[PDB]
Amino acid sequence: LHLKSNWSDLDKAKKLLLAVETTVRARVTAEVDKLNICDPQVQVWLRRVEELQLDAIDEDYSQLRKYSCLGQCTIHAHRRASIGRRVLEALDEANKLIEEGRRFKKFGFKPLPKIVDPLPQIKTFGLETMLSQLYDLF
Amino acid sequence: LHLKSNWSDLDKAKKLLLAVETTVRARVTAEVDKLNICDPQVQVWLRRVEELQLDAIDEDYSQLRKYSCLGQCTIHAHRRASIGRRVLEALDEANKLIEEGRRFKKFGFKPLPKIVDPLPQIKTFGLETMLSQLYDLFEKGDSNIIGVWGQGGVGKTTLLHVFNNDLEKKAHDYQVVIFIEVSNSEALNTVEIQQTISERLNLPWNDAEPIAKRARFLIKALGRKRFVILLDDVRKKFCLEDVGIPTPDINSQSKLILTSRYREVCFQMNAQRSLIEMQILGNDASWELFLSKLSTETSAAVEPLGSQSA
Ligand SMILES: Nc1ncnc2c1ncn2[C@@H]1O[C@H](COP(=O)(O)OP(=O)(O)OP(=O)(O)O)[C@@H](O)[C@H]1O
Question: What region holds the NB-ARC domain (chain B) (predicted)?
Fold first, then answer.
């Protein structure tokens, strides 16, 4: 019976993937604090991690466990194939994401300097006319 | 007969796994002592080690050893398959945990700086009214710069400490609260302030970076965060952009709180309309504070009521 072992491996992979995602997010947040934009590859990896949605197969396996009351009954044995393929797909996808996740070394890059750098914006009075004149000559 | 050899290998793996877990836990404890949070991967590994529960198969094999009286009898030979699979599963799982356990090199990481940094919480008396007033201007106030003035040593620093410590009770949208002690000099020692702000924002401090470039860097850094900076006892007018603090505007949710001994310098900070005068404590508050600084051998000589003594 490989289904239970594979689902347990999926549980371990899910926990370890949560740990890896937490570490990566912490590093990316540290880079962001330094005025740096997140690395595009790391952003794609984060998107794939967020879109994994292991909760769906978790609830699906729970629903099957509701009917896992008799192994002998086969009325519900048809959906075992769906679980058997989806759990394996989630497992090897998670393994690929883990192997990629552990490998990043850079997590950000300095963005190109902005077109305009903000300056102090102290409240002004009656400067509209001369500002318009400056725009006119500019 | 591979069962006995496999169980002996499981025993060796269990002992070596206990040793590995002890070493890893020692390293994690050392990292924790350094204010560092445990590495999530190491935490998951520790959880799996704790959830291994080799004692269960140990007792199960002992129960089988009670019936291990005859190899030939099939009465208990049925459970040999269960032992044969569970022992192997425990063995190769333990081997995987060992190979992973030996490989970690980092065991912790510096956590993100807290929303509020704790400050001394010396016991206060009769500060509730002015604390409520400070909250009123901090929340309702339409001006992002709040100025407080009063006589020297009337609790301005104490009010800032208690207010900053009380901010963690209430919920707010302010990510970072910064406490700055400007009264260290009248020459505006900018390096210490920049280091404090950089430390509070998890920024990597640099030694050879010029002051003006750092000021621009912090101005950009504070430009995306709703911050609450607490200047303490400012004594001369100084440009906020010079040190790196952006002057908050109505379009931003950041609030600036400063204290001073002089009304004029507070007026110079464009905080003329978030001004509160620090009134001295009342007679009842002064009396209840006075007892807190007296020994009972003296206090029990003064505290009791009813009987009147000089
Ligand atoms: N409500 C209070 N209850 C108890 N102690 C208080 C209270 N208010 C102030 N203090 C005491 O005042 C002492 C001096 O700090 P305080 O906050 O009064 O100074 P300050 O007004 O900031 O002074 P300065 O003008 O020199 O900067 C502290 O040691 C503190 O114990």
Answer: 130-294
Asked whether B155 and B127 are in contact (CB, 8 A), the reply is yes
A53: left (phi over 0), alpha (psi -120 to 50) or beta: left
CB distance B247–A120 less than 8 Å?
Answer: yes
Q: Is A75 exposed, middle or buried (0-12, 13-18, 19+ CB in 10 A)?
A: exposed
Rounded Cα gap, residues B108 and B248, in angstroms: 37
Rounded Cα distance, B158 and B285, in Å: 15
PDB resolution in Å:
4.6
Distance of CA B96 to the CA centre of its chain: 35
A121 to chain B: which residues are within 8 Å by CB? 249
Q: Is B157 in the pocket of ligand 1 (CB under 6 A)?
A: yes
What is the rounded CA–CA span in Å between residue B184 and residue B206?
22
- For residue B277, the CA-to-ligand 1 centroid distance in Å is 15
Q: How far apart are CA B78 and CA B71, in angstroms?
A: 12
Residue-wise over B240-250: b if at least 16 C-beta within 10 A, else e? Answer: bbebbbbbbee
Integer Cα distance of B36 and B112 in angstroms: 10
Q: How many CB atoms lie within 10 A of CB B117?
A: 15
**Inter-chain contact B223–A118, Cβ cutoff 8 Å?**
yes
DSSP code for B256: E
- Between CA B204 and CA A30 the distance in angstroms is 10
Q: What is the largest CA-CA distance in chain A?
A: 89
Helix count and strand count (H, E) for chain B: 12, 7
B188 burial via Cβ count (<10 Å: 0-12, 13-18, 19+) = middle
Calpha distance B104→B24 (Å, rounded): 9
Q: B230 and B180 in contact (C-beta within 8 Å)? A: yes
**Contact (Cβ atoms closer than 8 angstroms) between residue B121 and residue B277:** no
Pocket test for ligand 1, best of B157, B263, B266, B288 (most atoms within 8 A of CB): B157
CA separation for the pair B190, B199 (Å, rounded): 14
Residue of B nearest to A17 (CA): B41
Cβ of residue B153 lying under 6 Å from some atom of ligand 1: yes
How determined?
cryo-EM
Residues of B in contact with A105 (CB under 8 A): none
